[PDB]
Design a protein around this nucleic acid. Structure first.
Lengths: 332, 53
DNA sequence: TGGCATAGATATCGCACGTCTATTATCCTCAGCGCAATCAGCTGTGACTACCT
DNA sequence: AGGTAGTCACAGCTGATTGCGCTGAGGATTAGACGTGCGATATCTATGCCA
């Protein structure tokens, strides 16, 4: 029951739909009206819900009232809603039946053993002075566009490409992601992301050895499946979405053959601007992962950067980047 | 015509096979002559707004 | 001399090859509906002061 | 002169706000029949042969 690929509800033994299609409070297509009528007439012995943490929203909760179903089972990777709307969820669906031990599955080899790092990038003092200068939401662009962070990211990308690994760069800010991708000449995924182009880039990433570095915006969490990778670099944060970013990390990294014996077969790195409010957000975010037994080693000095030549080597280059970012005022 | 609540039917004058199937070819809209002059002046005025818009 | 087997000239219908036009559906893009972290006004708390005995 | 109630000046709670996302309504966009050439197929006729 999709808005693009439509099939008649008649004879549909098993139906797959989306929350928005069922929660479309505004007037829908006449065929959609017939589908809804058939669903209401149909008695559902079983219903399956994915990403249950999204249910506590009012519109998606109304879907439960809309649909008459006997058994409703919810499957998800995380349950720590930052809005603490989970107690009522215990009666929306039921008690949490099971939750596997992540470290145990790591030992059993079912999942890749993630190697997690927190990389501290000192802020440029000119950026830092402006960072102190701005107190508003515009301050995000200041620390999310750290030239030192850019150089560290470039060095890590070179290192992993020489290591021949799949690189996924997660950046919540659209402008920051586009700037990084354009400067590094890599594919970028953002708001619209026309589906054909998106699928083309994904299939190039899966198979083409020339493409192994993909920039994905916030859409990479649940809007589409992420091809399996080994290197996941997080630059931009939602602001403390300890569940969203953890879910996206778990979705990105999966078990890989060949590195099964090694305790570190998956690599994740979080680039955090030092002395910024990003530190508190990172600490709050990794709370759940620490509760999951995952450790994060803090790394400040990156060996090999001095030998390699990277972007913004000269000061005015960073000054030019500061000009570009400040051009993006609070409106952007 | 919808704004003026006047009957408006597209004039099907031919059929095109493009895209692997025969598709309707429409040539404007046929409207009753009695309202025609009333329909024309508004339309231009309608355009007179839209272009400014 | 007379009737009929057999060699010659002539097409002839069935089978396949090269080519065209039909007379009514599908695919990008925008305005309008949603989800997630700050910040101000409502509400709660502590202290100043007029009024009664 | 003494006590407690009416009333005005600072902290938490929570809805409004600023960053991002799905929909429904717009403009855009080739094989049976027909014609034609080839391949397998009959057919009329002049004349030689035999009784």
């Amino acid at each position: 029951f999709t808005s693009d690929a439509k099939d008649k509800p008649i004879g549909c033994s098993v139906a797959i739909s989306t929350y928005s299609m069922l929660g479309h409070t505004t007037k829908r297509s006449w065929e959609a009206e017939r589908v809804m009528e058939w669903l209401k007439t149909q008695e559902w012995g079983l219903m399956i819900l994915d990403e249950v943490h999204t249910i506590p929203a009012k519109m998606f909760r109304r879907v439960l009232t809309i649909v008459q179903a006997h058994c409703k089972l919810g499957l998800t990777a995380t349950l720590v809603r930052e809005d603490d709307k989970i107690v009522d969820l215990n009666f929306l669906i039921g008690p949490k039946l099971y939750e596997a031990n992540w470290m145990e599955l790591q030992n059993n080899g079912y999942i890749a053993k993630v190697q997690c790092a927190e990389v501290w990038c000192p802020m440029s003092p000119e950026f830092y002075r402006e960072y102190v200068a701005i107190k508003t939401k515009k301050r995000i662009l200041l620390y999310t566009m750290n030239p030192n962070k850019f150089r560290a990211c470039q060095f890590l990308i070179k290192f992993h490409e020489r290591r021949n690994d799949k690189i996924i760069v997660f950046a919540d800010n659209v402008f920051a992601l586009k700037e990084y991708a354009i400067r590094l000449n890599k594919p970028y995924i953002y708001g619209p992301t026309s589906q054909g182009e998106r699928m083309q880039i994904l299939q190039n990433f899966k198979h083409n050895p020339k493409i192994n570095t993909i920039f994905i915006s916030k859409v990479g969490d649940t809007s589409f499946d992420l091809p399996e990778a080994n290197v996941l670099i997080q630059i931009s944060s939602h602001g403390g979405s300890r569940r969203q970013e953890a879910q996206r990390l778990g979705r990105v990294l999966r078990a890989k053959k060949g590195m099964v014996a090694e305790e570190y077969n998956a690599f994740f790195y979080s680039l955090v601007s030092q002395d910024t409010q990003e530190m508190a957000y990172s600490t709050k975010r990794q709370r759940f992962l620490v509760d999951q037994g995952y450790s994060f080693k803090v790394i400040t000095k990156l060996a090999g950067m001095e030998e390699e030549d990277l972007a913004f080597s000269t000061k005015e280059e960073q000054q030019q980047l500061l000009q570009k970012v400040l051009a993006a005022t609070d409106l952007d | 015509a919808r704004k003026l609540d006047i009957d408006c039917v597209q004039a099907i004058t031919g059929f095109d096979f493009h895209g692997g199937y025969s598709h309707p070819v429409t040539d404007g809209y046929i409207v009753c002559e009695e309202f025609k002059d009333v329909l024309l002046t508004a339309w231009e005025n309608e355009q007179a707004v839209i272009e400014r818009k």
